[PDB]
Every structure is written in structure tokens, then in C-alpha cells.
Amino acid sequence: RRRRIILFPVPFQGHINPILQLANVLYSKGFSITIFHTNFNKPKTSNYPHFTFRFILDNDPQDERISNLPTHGPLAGMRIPIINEHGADELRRELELLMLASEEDEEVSCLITDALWYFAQSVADSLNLRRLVLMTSSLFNFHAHVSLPQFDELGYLDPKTRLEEQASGFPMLKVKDIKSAYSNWQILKEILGKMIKQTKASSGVIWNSFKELEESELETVIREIPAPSFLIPLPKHLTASSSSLLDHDRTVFQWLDQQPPSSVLYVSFGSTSEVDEKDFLEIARGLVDSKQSFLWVVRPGFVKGSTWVEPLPDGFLGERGRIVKWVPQQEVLAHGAIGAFWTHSGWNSTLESVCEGVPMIFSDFGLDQPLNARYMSDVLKVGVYLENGWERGEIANAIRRVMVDEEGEYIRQNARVLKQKADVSLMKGGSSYESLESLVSYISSLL
Ligand SMILES: O=c1ccn([C@@H]2O[C@H](COP(=O)(O)OP(=O)(O)O)[C@@H](O)[C@H]2O)c(=O)[nH]1
């Protein structure tokens, strides 16, 4: 192959997934693929015989800052600022030796990194290597981020109570959404600033989205980011099953085959989300009160003070519920049994659900999640946002609204229609197809 692309993921599930979907889409367009990855949280390389992996940054000589960090929880993510602050020299050496050791008929066209690797911009620049960025969060989230200076001056960033009102200058959000999203503003201000700055300075931004999903946000991206933006809905191309870091339960499909069509609520609150025991029990009570069948992925550590789901009484989630640890999520969402998805509103999950035409119930645990929940619930109207905590009646009502009630037909139909828009976008002539054609041509032009 004439042209090689190097991709550099953030080594967590929500970041490795999109970047290896992208790598596949690019391989299909005729690029060879090298993945630069930490040893930490590496995917299964035997799932990718067509890719070359090069492991970097935490190899066994290994700096003292990255040694001793836990492999899971919230502290595992301290690898990100550490690598941003200390990885530049090594990333440069690794890139250069690959650029030099390439064939006569082969060239390295570009580096694609996660947006959180803001340090890679200065490194790629120093090699005259073009860096493109993969955003793993939505265009709307970005639009909210660049509106922070106006939120600050309106005094929405102070923990003042105008919580239920539309935000002035940003009518799609309520003040509470902004409060929730930017609950650690003063803390994360500097690092978020760096990610934005270096994304703006990149050679192109690939968004895991499609035009017809976030059409209100496209002008912001054209205005605020001088580099070209490309929108590709990765889950429409292929699922992320090959980049799973955990063993799929898979016995779920036998259970799903015993369920009537559209009768199952899929429930998953996210990789690092945490609840008090009180709220965990309130969620379970909500699920039982809904009377719907459910498949609930609970990650160990979801319930504060418990290893897994110990506070649940025996048989409390009777015949119609199943709790598992891990599934091939998009494949589950594609299964005919699934009627809805109660999500924490992480962007991959949200987008997978959209691409599978599954309507949603939204909870959030901050960051971009309340913004995704607000946009999907109030703008697209493909789900119901439980935006006032956890209360069994409200939960049960939301589940039933989406899965059963005639009054929620609009939500179900909107989800079907939005899937169709995603499918159309991929076909020759569609917005994503053309965005991908432009990306391929753009990358091929960079030399
Ligand atoms: O049981 C599971 C739960 C999650 N996922 C995948 O893990 C990723 C989670 O990303 P997301 O952005 O939704 O949120 P995070 O969990 O990173 O907060 C998605 O691609 C899901 O499809 C999965 O394959 N199986």
C-alpha cells in the first residue's frame, strides 16, 4: 500500500473504540494502518491482523509518574495529563523512526490522535507531519465549550439558582445543564483550554457524528476551527466489538432470543460512573416498577462501597431482569428484542443507540453527558431525560413512556427516522459518504 496512517488512541474504552473504527474505515479506503498505543489497556492485536501495532510511552523501562497508577477507577485517567506533560520526546522518536524506516513506494501521510493528546500537535509539527484529531465527543459539546466565557460572565459557573430556566445566549441548554457539565470548571479550565487550542491548530478534525444529527452545530465548528472538519458516524461503518478490552458475556444473545421484539430495556450507566447505595437501590426499584424486561450492564464499582451489586436483595430483579458485566453493546442494541436504552449519555453509547435506531432514557454523571442528554432529549427528541436525580416513579414513567406508552410513539419513531438518516448519510451521495471521500482525498493530498 502506497500510503500509511498512524493512529494514536487514548487508552480507555470510549476512546479506543472510535479510533479503531476509524482505522478500519481508512484501511478500507486503501491506507495501511499503524496504531501507536500504550501497553496499558491495549486492545487484542490478534483482532487486527491487517494493522501494525507499535506500543509506546509506558514500555517497561517506564517512568515513575506512570508506574504505581491504578489500572481502573477515576485515577487511571491521570495517565492522560502525565503523558501530555512528559511524552513528547518519546512520541517524536517513535514517529521519526517509522517515517525513516518506511519503503520507497510507501509514505506516512499523517498522524491521527485523540483530541485529548494535545501534546501531539507540537510533536507532529516538529516532524512536518500533519496531525488530524479525532473528537470522541459531540459537536454540541464543543459548541458549549467555546461558549464558556459568556456562561462565566452570566454567573452560571458559580456554585446562584436560575436552574430550570433556558440559558440566555444558548437556548438549547438549561442553566442546571451548564452547572452540571462544568461542575469542575476552575479545576479543568486549563487542560480543556489546551485540548481546544491544539485541536483548533490541527490539520483536520474528524468528528464521530453526522450532519443530520448535529446540523445546528456545524456553523460553530466551521467558525471556531480553521482546520477542515469531517463527520463520520463510525458505528454505521462497523461496530467496535474488535476493540473490546473486556470479555463479552455473549450468553446475553440466547436470553435476548427468548424475549419478544422491542420488549427489553438495555441499561448501562457507563465505565466510570458511580452512585450511592441509596440511588442504586432507587434505580433498581425504578426498573422493577417499570415492569419491563431489562438487560443491565453494571460495571464493578458502580455502587460506592460495594464490589459489584451486593446491595441488591436476592431475586429483587426477578425473571424479567438480567445483570451482566459486559456485552458487545452495539450488537445488543441491534438485537430485535431491544426496545430502549437507559444510558448515562456517553457519546459512543448515545451514537451507537442512534445508529441502531434505539430510543433512550438519559441519566448523566457530568462532563459532556448532561449536554448529550439535553440535546438528544429536547432537540432531536429520541429520548427522555431524567434530569432531577433518581426517583422510582419518575424512572418507571420514563421507561414506560419510551417502550410502551402510545404517548411515546414519537420518541420511538424519531429514533427510527434518525437511524435511517444515518444509513442514508453513508450511501454514495450522502453527507458522511462525501465527508469520508473528502477525508481520503485530503489525506492523500497532504504530501
Ligand atoms: O457492556 C458494554 C458497555 C459499553 N460498551 C462500549 O463501551 C463504550 C463506552 O463509551 P461511552 O462513550 O458510551 O461512555 P464511557 O463508558 O466511556 O463513559 C461504547 O463504545 C460502548 O458500546 C460495550 O461494548 N459493552
Residue numbers in the entry: 11 to 169, 172 to 459
Task: Quote the original article.
We have determined the structures of complexes of both the wild type and H25A mutant of UGT76G1 with UDP, the wild type with UDP and Reb A, and the wild type with UDP and Rubu. There is one molecule of UGT76G1 in the asymmetric unit and no stable symmetry-related multimer is identified by the PISA web server. The protein structures are all essentially identical within an r.m.s.d. of 0.4–0.9 Å over the Cα atoms. The electron density difference maps show clear density for UDP in all structures. UDP sits across the two helices Cα3 and Cα4, contacting three β-strands (Cβ3, Cβ4, and Cβ5), and is perpendicular to the central six-stranded β-sheet of the C-terminal domain. The uridine ring of UDP π-stacks against Trp 338 and forms two hydrogen bonds to the backbone (amide and carbonyl) of Val 339. The O2 and O3 hydroxyl groups of the ribose ring form a bidentate hydrogen bond with Glu 364, and a hydrogen bond forms between O3 hydroxyl and the side group amide of Asn 27. Two of the α-phosphate oxygens are bound by the main chain amides and side chains of Asn 360 and Ser 361. The pyrophosphate oxygen and two oxygen atoms of β-phosphate are linked to the NE2 of the imidazole ring of His 356 and to the amide and hydroxyl group of Ser 283, which is in the flexible loop between the Cβ1-strand and Cα1-helix. Upon Reb A or Rubu binding, the β-phosphate shows a slight shift, but the rest of UDP remains unchanged in our structures. The interactions with UDP observed here are conserved in other GT-B fold glycosyltransferases.
